């Protein structure tokens, strides 16, 4: 057997940033400044992204090790703040939209932003950490689903698969293809196994901003006409569920869950499409 269904826990008080880290604009604001920027960026841009995302996938990677049972999410929201803050990175989530953690932690049926707090993972959990960083004046964006003990093999072999659609979506980026190519790849994927990929959610460009205004679409949908081409920057970040998709957020009013309670994973990395393909600028 796995465990029960979750219930929120308490937070910890708000993790400080020392004031030399320049804060994105929409901190101490409660909406933010985003959603009509250029979707092809400056070379300048470009280089600043790979350096916020190599300090985001560290960050990641330095809390997805901790995962194991017994640990807090609050404690890998410790982990990632304290790396990106030791890197002079800003969290991007730390105070986006009133968010009030560095990074969102999403175990077992969260579909997304589940909020660091007292919950302690156990044995068979699936746990995601989403973590962006936001240094010379951009973002880096990455998620990862990491086990917790032994995993059940359908849960196993969900985080498996949504980890190889999201790799087998990457691989398509492409100068000239339709951007509409990546939620035909993961979703055909997804359906071989019966599993049903999220739709009010998606990947978005990003840059100079958290979530730019391009959509990216993980299920099939051939009618949007948008091109991949080079210098564009966005996320691949599907979120794959084992049951239905209807969910239904916490009285928080931000941990996303599945309403039948069966358990969903996700991956996600930030990507720009080269001249001949594509660079994962999320990578260690
Ligand atoms: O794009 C992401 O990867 C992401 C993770 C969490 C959020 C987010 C979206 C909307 C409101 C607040 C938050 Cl933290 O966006
Ligand atoms: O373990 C790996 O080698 C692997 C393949 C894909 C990923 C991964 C990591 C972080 C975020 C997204 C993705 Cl797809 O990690
Ligand atoms: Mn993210
Ligand atoms: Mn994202």
Known sequence: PSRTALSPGVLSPTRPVPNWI??????????????????????????????????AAGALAEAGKAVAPGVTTDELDRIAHE?????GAYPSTLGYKGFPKSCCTSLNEV????????????????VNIDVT??????????????????????????????????????????????????????????????????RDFTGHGIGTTFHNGLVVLHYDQPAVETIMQPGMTFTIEPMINLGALDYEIWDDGWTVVT????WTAQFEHTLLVTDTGVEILTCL
């Open 22 to 55: 320049a804060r994105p604009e929409y901190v101490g604001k409660p909406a933010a400044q985003e959603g009509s920027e250029p979707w092809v960026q400056t070379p300048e841009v470009i280089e600043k992204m790979r350096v916020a995302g190599r300090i």
């Open 111 to 126: 579909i997304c932003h589940g909020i660091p707090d007292s919950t302690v993972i156990t044995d068979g959990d699936i």
């Open 259 to 262: 309403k039948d309670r069966k």
């Open 83 to 87: 790396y990106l803050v030791d890197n």
């Open 133 to 198: 960083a936001y240094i010379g004046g951009v973002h880096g964006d990455t998620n990862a689903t990491f086990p917790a003990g032994d995993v059940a093999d359908e849960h196993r072999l969900l985080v498996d698969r949504t980890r190889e659609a999201t790799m087998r979506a990457i691989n398509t980026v492409k100068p000239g293809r339709a951007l509409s190519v990546i939620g035909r790849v993961i979703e055909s994927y997804a359906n071989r196994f019966g599993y049903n990929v999220v």
